[PDB]
Amino acid sequence: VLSPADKTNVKAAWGKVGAHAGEYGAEALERMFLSFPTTKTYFPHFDLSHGSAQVKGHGKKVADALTNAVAHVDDMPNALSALSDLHAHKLRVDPVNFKLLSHCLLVTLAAHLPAEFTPAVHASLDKFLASVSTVLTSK
């Protein structure tokens, strides 16, 4: 479970990301595609080149889903239900891939929040993303 300290650390980091969230989501996706090429096959109809409007667009979707999870942190299964259904059933996303994107999301925050990415906040974010990943692979 996420402690109150975790919830506080995560809400904080989100605060500092501010309006760059969609942009950071896009960068996270690009990092994943380049570092872990197997993930690209889920996006055969995307142009995955740098600056791609489709990757930017999807990054915003992802960041919005994560913000919704933060905003309803105590009720994530319910909040992320439609996305759980989407990822497990229709898309059949391999569970391992959630660890990959999570790692790239952490890398992306690290590269943008010098002050905020302390060891404690790193820990809290990792736990947040693992909780999201758990929900997204529950169906």
Binding site: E27, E30, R31, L34, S35, F36, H50, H103, C104, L106, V107, T108, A110, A111, H112, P114, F117, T118, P119, A120, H122, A123, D126
Partner: protein, 146 residues
């Protein structure tokens, strides 16, 4: 673990700017904080009861130095990681019984540390080259399990 010349370039250029007395302890510390079960292997280090305690722990910093020392070595022998890490393999595998998944974790933590310290400079292509590297090392360190 074949890096293209461009991947090689990306890794070595950044690595020359790394503070070898600090980055290792930063990565080990973070490991023990983020994945607390790893503290099982370091009970002798003293106070690991907090993040601040772990990071500011002299034994963490000290040990992290040798870990980063090991990484620096592999970066020198990407051509032969197996041979380079053979002895460390026996130790972590045959004597310590650390599950190899933890080698992948420490590698990813190191990658987060590099991103933290280098910001924009740690571009997505630079990260991709480093993921190739830390995967090659984790795998070599795990060879005494295969």
């Amino acid at each position: 673990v074949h890096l293209t010349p461009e991947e090689k370039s990306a890794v070595t250029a950044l690595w020359g700017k790394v503070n070898v007395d600090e980055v290792g302890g930063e990565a080990l510390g973070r490991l023990l904080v983020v994945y607390p079960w790893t503290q099982r292997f370091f009970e002798s280090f003293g106070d690991l009861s907090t993040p601040d305690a772990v990071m500011g722990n002299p034994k963490v910093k000290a040990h992290g130095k040798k870990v980063l020392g090991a990484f620096s070595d592999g970066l020198a022998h990407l051509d032969n990681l197996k041979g380079t890490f053979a002895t460390l393999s026996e130790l972590h595998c045959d004597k310590l019984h650390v599950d190899p998944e933890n080698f992948r974790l420490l590698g990813n933590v190191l990658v987060c540390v590099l991103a933290h310290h280098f910001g924009k400079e740690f571009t997505p292509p630079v990260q991709a080259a480093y993921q190739k590297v830390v995967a090659g090392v984790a795998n070599a360190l795990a060879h005494k399990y295969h």
